[PDB]
Amino acid sequence: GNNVVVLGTQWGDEGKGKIVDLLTERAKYVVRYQGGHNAGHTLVINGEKTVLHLIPSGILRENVTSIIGNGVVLSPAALMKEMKELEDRGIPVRERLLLSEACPLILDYHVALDNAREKARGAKAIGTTGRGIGPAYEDKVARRGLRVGDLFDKETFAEKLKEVMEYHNFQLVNYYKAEAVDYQKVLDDTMAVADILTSMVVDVSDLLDQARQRGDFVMFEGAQGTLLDIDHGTYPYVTSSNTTAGGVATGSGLGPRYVDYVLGILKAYSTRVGAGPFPTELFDETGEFLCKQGNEFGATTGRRRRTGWLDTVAVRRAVQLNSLSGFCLTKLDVLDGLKEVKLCVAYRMPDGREVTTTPLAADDWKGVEPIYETMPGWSESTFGVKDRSGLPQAALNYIKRIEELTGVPIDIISTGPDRTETMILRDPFDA
């Protein structure tokens, strides 16, 4: 299909960057539709690694036009830092990146609040990346926040900013008792690159409509994952944007009817950074082992990730909400050397009931116990293999079982961090 969505079927970190980078080879555009610099992906081409956060994972490809859509809360300081790093490396960012005047601006006071609020929560802390995403999203809905388009009239920008900062400082010092974020600093910092951001402005919605009418390969790229959806994830242990496929049309302007195929990045086992329900969470040697072989540490905060088994019950939630077309199974290689592998098939509720459906809010995950099927592991190295014939039957049955339990075929399989250590059984674009 012409319009292909790529997102996280678990709790982010399942492998989006590598995949969008791999698949954008035929794309004209690439779009980020939600999130901000809370994201973090490691792309790896012939060993050379690239860590992105705010910038779409098609930015290294010349033939592609990256675009950060209105859904995204954009941080001026952040883009700039990622910009120089890629330019210093031969990737002419400003020449290939487009943005939307409607993106909300993440400014210092936003980090100041996120840290404050996260502090106040004490032990019930969310475990946020610490980037100011929540508050930026807050001012967005409150209709008090500033967006890229605001930079068109600098005088006016400064007026708005002065009072938004007026509003936010009163709380910071009087309520949380933290230090105030100085207005001039913020005004100066921002004005120093206002001209850069604004140059990058394009009417995104009308552009996708234009690209759609011509049949241009557009790939939409998600951040975080499904269970982090502000509406459908483990509330309140979630991010503040609709990480689910519904965020595509809202944060881009493309009418929902034009979503062709939805690719769900499915990690071979599970991970999660931040507080929150995690049924299949492993605290044993295997947990330790997964974190190890999977080099499981946040690409944004460097925090160790919580590890556990693949959860089919949870994955099945991801299927229905995103209207999945297929799965891209990643990190199958990390399970190498495991005597046996389990996949959560059902939940045992605190009241003795057996279920195949996930609770909604986090408190409703409290009792919940995972019921599994324990399949045999495999001694063979699957790393870098690029053909199924190179996959031992154990690994094949594990894959097949996954499909059976979900009703969704594994269209691509990743066996290593490098773009090429991959096998595409069907390109989301060829249907």
Ligand X SMILES: O=c1[nH]cnc2c1ncn2[C@@H]1O[C@H](COP(=O)(O)O)[C@@H](O)[C@H]1O
Ligand Y SMILES: Nc1nc2c(ncn2[C@@H]2O[C@H](COP(=O)(O)OP(=O)(O)O)[C@@H](O)[C@H]2O)c(=O)[nH]1
4-43 positions binding ligand HDA, by CB under 6 A: 12-13, 39-40
Select which of 21, 37, 41, 168 is catalytic. Answer: 41
Our finding on whether 334 is near ligand Y (CB under 6 A) is yes
Cβ atoms 415, 384 nearer than 8 A: yes
Note the Cα 357 to chain centre separation in Å: 23
Our finding on whether 299 is near Mg ion (CB under 5 A) is yes
Size of the site for ligand HDA (CB under 6 A): 11
Q: Residue 168, annotated ligand binder?
A: no
Candidates 121-129, 161-169, 337-345, 380-388; binding stretch for ligand X (CB under 6 A): 121-129
Q: Residue 361, annotated ligand binder?
A: no
Instruction: Return the beta strands (E) in 279-364 as ranges.
Output: 306-308, 310-311, 326-330, 340-348, 354-355
Q: Which of 52, 60, 79, 223 binds ligand X (CB under 6 A)?
A: 223
Token pair, residue 244, equals: 């689910």
Chosen from ligand HDA, its own copies, ligand Y, none, partner binding at 222 (C-beta under 5 to 8 Å by type): none
Strands 354-355 and 340-348: antiparallel
CA distance 219 to 208: 11
Chosen from ligand Y, Mg ion, ligand X, none, partner binding at 67 (C-beta under 5 to 8 Å by type): none
Measured from the CB atom, the residue of 208 and 266 that comes closer to ligand Y is 266
CA distance 363 to 235: 8
What are the Cα distances from residue 7, in Å, to 18, 48, 122, 210, 388?
A: 12, 24, 32, 24, 24
CA distance 48 to 22: 15
Our finding on whether 333 is near ligand Y (CB under 6 A) is yes
Q: Which residues pair with 32 in a beta bridge?
A: 68, 221
CA distance 209 to 230: 27
Write the single-letter amino acid at 196.
I
Instruction: Return the beta strands (E) in 218-339 as ranges.
Output: 218-221, 261-267, 270-272, 306-308, 310-311, 326-330
Instruction: Tell me phi and psi for residue 352, to 5 degrees.
Output: 80, -10
Measured from the CB atom, the residue of 15 and 151 that comes closer to ligand X is 15
Candidates 222-230, 260-268, 344-352, 380-388; binding stretch for ligand X (CB under 6 A): 222-230
Q: Which of 9, 129, 244, 252 binds ligand X (CB under 6 A)?
A: 129
Cβ atoms 338, 358 nearer than 8 A: no
Q: Residue 267, annotated ligand binder?
A: no
The question of whether 430 is a catalytic residue gets the answer no
Q: Residue 42, annotated ligand binder?
A: yes
Measured from the CB atom, the residue of 255 and 337 that comes closer to its own copies is 255
The question of whether 53 is a catalytic residue gets the answer no
Run of H or E including 135: helix 133-142
What angle separates helix 183-199 from helix 76-87, to the nearest 10 degrees? 50
We find the least distance from the C-beta atom of residue 17 to Mg ion, in angstroms, to be 7
Write the binding mask 286 to 305 for ligand Y: x where contact by CB under 6 A, - elsewhere: ---------x---x------
We find the least distance from the C-beta atom of residue 208 to Mg ion, in angstroms, to be 25
Measured from the CB atom, the residue of 133 and 254 that comes closer to ligand HDA is 133
We find the least distance from the C-beta atom of residue 354 to ligand HDA, in angstroms, to be 33
Strands 340-348 and 369-376: antiparallel
We find the least distance from the C-beta atom of residue 139 to ligand HDA, in angstroms, to be 22
Closest CA to 369 of 284, 269, 279, 281: 279
Cβ atoms 244, 10 nearer than 8 A: no
Q: Residue 38, annotated ligand binder?
A: yes
Write the binding mask 287 to 326 for ligand HDA: x where contact by CB under 6 A, - elsewhere: -----------xxxx-x-----------------------
Our finding on whether 256 is near its own copies (CB under 8 A) is yes
| Residues that constitute the known binding site for substrate | 299-305
| Binding site as annotated, residues | 12-18, 38-42, 129, 143, 224, 239, 299-305, 331-333, 414-416
The residue ranges that bind ligand X (CB under 6 A) are: 12-13, 38-40, 126-129, 131, 133-134, 223-224, 228, 239-240, 273-274
Interface residues with Mg ion (CB under 5 A)?
13, 40, 299
Active site residues: 13, 41
